[PDB]
Design a protein around this ligand. Structure first.
Ligand SMILES: Nc1nc2c(ncn2[C@@H]2O[C@H](COP(=O)(O)OP(=O)(O)OP(=O)(O)O)[C@@H](O)[C@H]2O)c(=O)[nH]1
Ligand SMILES: [Mn+2]
Ligand SMILES: [Mn+2]
Ligand code: NA
Ligand code: NA
Length: 461
C-alpha cells in the first residue's frame, strides 16, 4: 500500500470531516481492582502523550508496493485456491437489495452503529433513517443509490480503543476507513452469496474462519490440520498489500463466477480517502471498514501462504496444505515441517512483513501447546479431551475490563468477557468473578457461574 497524493479537501470540493477529539474511554468500576497497562489511543495531533508526529505515524502503515505483477507462483496459487472454493458450489447470483440490507441465512443485517460514510457523514443523515428492520424498505436506500451512486470516498476515522503505551507514544493509532452505505450495500449485493458461503463454511475449504464461533469451532480445527503446524503474524498486513494481490484476488473471483463484478475489488485497491480536512489517494492497501474487508483479506492470505510455499518449496503439495485465516491472522499446517523463518523471508519479496507467531523473539516450532489463533489458545477439556477449549489469556480480559465507553453497556461488556474467561478454568473464573464482585457495580451485574457455562458448553456440540 502507498499514498499517491494528499491535499486539502476544499481544493477539490470536499467538506471537512469532524472527528471527536476526545476518547470515549474512561476508567471503569474495575479500573483499580484489575491490572492493566493500556490507555486510549491518540485521537488528535495535540495529545500530550505523543513522542513523534501523529500525522506521519498514522499513515506510515503504507510501507509501499513491493511487487508489481502477478507472477507464476501467484498464478498457481490462484488456480489451486480457486479450485478448492470451486468445490463449495457457491451461488454466483447477485443478492436482492432487501437481503443485502436486512440480512438472510449466512449474512447478518447491516450494522446500525457504524458510520454511514460520505456524503451522509458531513450531510447529517444516519443509518437510523434510511433503514427500517421490520419494514425492510428498499425504497429509501434504492432512492439514495440512484441519487448518489456508488464508488464513493472513504471517510477515515482514528479508531478509539486501548493501545500499549508504546503505540500511544508513537502515535500508532489504528485508522478506520469507512465506506458509504451505498458502496457497502452494492458490494453486499454483488458478493452477498459469497459472504454467506464463507460464513456458513468456516474451515480448510474456504481457508476462512470469518463468522466462526470459537466455542464450537476450536474443536473442529485440530482435526482439519495436518501433522506439522506453522504460523506467523503480519505487521501492517492490510496496508502492505500491493495492487498485484488484489489482481490475484479478482482472478479467483473471476474463476468462480464473479468475473461479473470484480470491478469492486478495484476500488478496494485504488481508493479515495477523506481524513479530517485532507483528502488522499491510495494505491493498494485493503481499506479496514469496507463491506467484505475481512473476507477478502482471508482470501488474499490464502493466496499469499500458497505463493510463498510454491516459491520456497518447489514440488510442495498444496492439496495437503491445511490452513485457516481470519484476516491477517492464520493457523496453517503441512504433513512435513517447514521453515517459517524462510517463508517469512520470501514474504518480504512480496511486500509482506511476517514475524514469529505472537511476537516471539525468533521462529520456534509450532505446537498445539503454544499455538494461538485470534489470541486464543487450544486446550483440550480435562474431563472430555475431544472437546477443545478456545483459551483467551486473562491479561487480555483484565485489560478490557478496566475501561468503559458507555456505562449502560457494563452488563453486556462484562458478561461478554465472562464468556471468554471461563475457559481458563474454574479456579481462574471464580477469582475473576470474586474481584468483579468486590465493588458495588460488579455485585449488581448478572454474571453466569462456572458450572452453568461449562455444562451449557458441553451440550452445545
Ligand atoms: N487500521 C485498522 N486495522 C484493523 C482494524 N481492525 C482490524 N485491523 C487489523 O489490525 C492491523 C493493525 O494492527 P496493529 O496492532 O497496529 O499492527 P500489527 O502489524 O498486527 O502488530 P505489530 O507487528 O506489533 O506492528 C491491520 O493490519 C488489520 O489487519 C481497523 O479497524 N483498522
Ligand atoms: Mn499483528
Ligand atoms: Mn492478527
Ligand atoms: Na486501498
Ligand atoms: Na505486497
Amino acid at each position: 500500500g502507498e499514498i499517491q497524493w494528499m491535499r486539502p479537501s476544499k481544493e477539490v470540493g470536499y467538506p471537512i470531516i469532524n472527528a471527536p477529539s476526545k476518547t470515549k474511554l474512561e476508567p471503569s468500576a474495575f479500573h483499580y481492582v484489575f491490572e492493566g497497562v493500556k490507555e486510549p489511543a491518540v485521537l488528535t495531533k495535540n495529545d500530550p502523550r505523543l513522542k513523534t508526529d501523529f500525522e506521519e505515524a498514522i499513515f506510515s502503515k503504507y510501507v509501499g508496493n513491493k511487487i508489481t505483477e502477478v507472477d507464476e507462483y501467484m498464478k498457481e496459487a490462484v488456480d489451486h485456491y480457486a479450485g478448492q472454493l470451486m468445490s463449495l458450489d457457491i451461488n454466483t447470483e447477485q443478492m436482492c437489495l432487501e437481503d443485502a440490507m436486512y440480512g438472510t441465512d449466512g449474512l447478518e443485517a447491516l450494522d446500525l452503529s457504524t458510520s454511514a460514510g460520505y456524503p451522509y457523514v458531513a450531510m447529517g443523515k444516519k443509518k437510523r433513517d434510511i433503514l427500517n428492520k421490520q419494514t425492510r424498505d428498499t425504497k429509501e436506500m434504492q432512492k439514495l443509490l440512484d441519487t448518489y451512486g456508488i464508488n464513493l470516498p472513504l471517510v477515515t476515522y482514528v479508531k478509539d480503543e486501548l493501545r500499549s503505551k508504546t503505540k500511544v507514544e508513537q502515535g500508532k493509532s489504528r485508522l478506520i476507513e469507512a465506506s458509504s452505505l451505498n458502496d457497502s450495500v452494492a458490494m453486499r449485493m454483488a458478493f452477498g452469496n459469497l459472504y454467506a458461503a464463507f460464513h456458513k463454511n468456516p474451515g480448510v475449504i474456504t481457508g476462512s474462519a470469518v463468522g466462526c464461533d470459537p466455542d464450537l469451532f476450536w474443536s473442529k480445527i485440530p482435526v482439519l490440520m495436518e501433522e506439522k503446524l506453522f504460523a506467523f503474524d503480519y505487521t501492517g498486513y492490510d496496508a502492505s498489500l500491493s495492487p498485484a494481490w488484489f489482481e490475484a484476488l479478482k482472478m479467483v473471483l473471476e474463476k468462480i463466477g464473479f468475473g461479473d463484478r470484480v470491478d469492486y475489488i478495484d476500488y478496494l485497491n485504488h481508493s479515495h480517502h477523506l481524513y479530517k480536512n485532507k483528502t488522499y489517494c491510495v494505491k493498494g492497501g485493503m481499506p479496514s471498514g469496507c463491506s467484505g474487508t475481512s473476507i477478502f483479506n482471508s482470501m488474499i492470505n490464502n493466496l499469499i501462504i500458497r505463493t510463498l510455499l510454491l516459491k520456497t518449496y518447489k514440488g510442495i503439495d498444496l492439496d495437503h496444505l491445511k490452513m485457516i485465516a481470519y484476516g491477517d491472522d492464520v493457523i496453517a499446517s503441512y504433513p512435513h515441517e517447514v521453515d517459517a523463518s524462510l517463508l517469512a523471508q520470501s514474504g518480504k519479496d512480496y511486500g509482506l512483513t511476517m514475524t514469529p507467531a505472537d511476537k516471539s523473539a525468533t521462529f520456534e516450532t509450532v505446537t498445539w501447546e503454544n499455538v494461538t489463533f485470534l489470541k486464543r489458545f487450544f486446550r483440550a477439556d480435562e474431563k472430555y479431551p475431544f472437546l477443545i477449549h478456545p483459551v483467551m489469556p486473562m491479561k487480555e480480559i483484565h485489560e478490557s475490563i478496566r475501561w468503559t465507553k458507555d456505562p449502560r453497556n457494563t452488563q453486556d461488556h462484562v458478561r461478554s468477557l465472562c464468556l471468554l474467561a471461563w475457559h481458563n478454568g474454574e479456579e481462574e473464573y471464580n477469582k475473576f468473578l470474586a474481584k468483579i464482585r468486590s465493588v458495588p457495580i460488579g455485585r449488581a451485574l448478572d454474571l453466569p457461574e462456572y458450572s452453568t457455562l461449562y455444562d451449557r458448553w458441553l451440550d452445545s456440540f
